[PDB]
Ligand binder design. Structure first.
Ligand SMILES: C[C@](O)(COc1ccc(Cl)c(F)c1)C(=O)Nc1ccc(C#N)c(C(F)(F)F)c1
Length: 247
């Protein structure tokens, strides 16, 4: 199980937001903590991504672009999983020190998105997603959004994405001699992975609007995040960069 050994081995550990939970909730503080948390997780997403099998094959510019585009979705997916395993989807486990109840979902002004992620969290349970299916599905997510104009080395990207799909097939076939059983599972999983995109889109849109009026709501946007939101996110919202759906 070389491939899964690698995925387990590089899976980021716990990342805290540094939020002050002794302070009454507020939009400004919850959002600054979400911004800071997002940035902290990005540090790990980059280290994770670069240690992924075959990733280094991608052109240097493609590696960075793909990480930045996939950044939101990857966080959404892992957060839903953490929410499921830690609190049985009762709340959204953004981080040990940043857990959202409905009140916080409402106060963050990201209520519709949070509810959608809570449903995703429940999906992990309802579909009985295994830790290994999760790990492989997450790696696949990193290769699920590309520019219409194409990457520097599109062929390398396609090969890599195809190999990751092949690994998902193997994890699914492992202990399923019934083809019909494998097919239904692949259907369920690709359906779950597609559901992540629309959620990341609503968060992208929300964050973009927020950045534009950040000075009007007292939100502190970190350096790297502001740059990525103003350079990369606009490409997604305008349709120049699109997610790869299965269905
Ligand atoms: C608003 C924000 O602070 C920043 O989100 C962005 C992150 C990346 C990009 Cl490309 C963006 F446009 C916004 C945020 O959503 N942070 C955030 C931090 C951690 C997690 C986790 N886990 C999440 C997520 F994915 F659950 F929604 C979100």
């Amino acid at each position: 199980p070389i491939f899964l050994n690698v995925l387990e081995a590089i899976e980021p550990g716990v990342v805290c937001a540094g939020h002050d939970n002794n302070q009454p909730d507020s939009f400004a503080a919850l959002l600054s903590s979400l911004n800071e948390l997002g940035e902290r997780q990005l540090v790990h997403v980059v280290k994770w991504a670069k240690a992924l099998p075959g990733f280094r094959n991608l052109h240097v510019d493609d590696q960075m672009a793909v990480i930045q585009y996939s950044w939101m979705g990857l966080m959404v997916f892992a957060m839903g999983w953490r929410s499921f395993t830690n609190v049985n989807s009762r709340m959204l486990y953004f981080a040990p020190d940043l857990v959202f109840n409905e009140y916080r979902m409402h106060k963050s002004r990201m209520y519709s998105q949070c509810v959608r992620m809570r449903h995703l969290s429940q999906e992990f349970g309802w579909l009985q997603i295994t830790p290994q299916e999760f790990l492989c599905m997450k790696a696949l997510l990193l290769f699920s959004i590309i520019p219409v104009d194409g990457l520097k080395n599109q062929k390398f990207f396609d090969e890599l994405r195809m190999n990751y799909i092949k690994e998902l097939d193997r994890i699914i076939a492992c202990k399923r001699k019934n083809p019909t059983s494998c097919s239904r599972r692949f259907y369920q999983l690709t359906k779950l992975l597609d559901s992540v995109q629309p959620i990341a889109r609503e968060l992208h849109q929300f964050t973009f609007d927020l950045l534009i009026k950040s000075h009007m709501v007292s939100v502190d946007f970190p350096e790297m995040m502001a740059e990525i939101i103003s350079v990369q996110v606009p490409k997604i919202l305008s349709g120049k960069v699109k997610p790869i759906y299965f269905h």
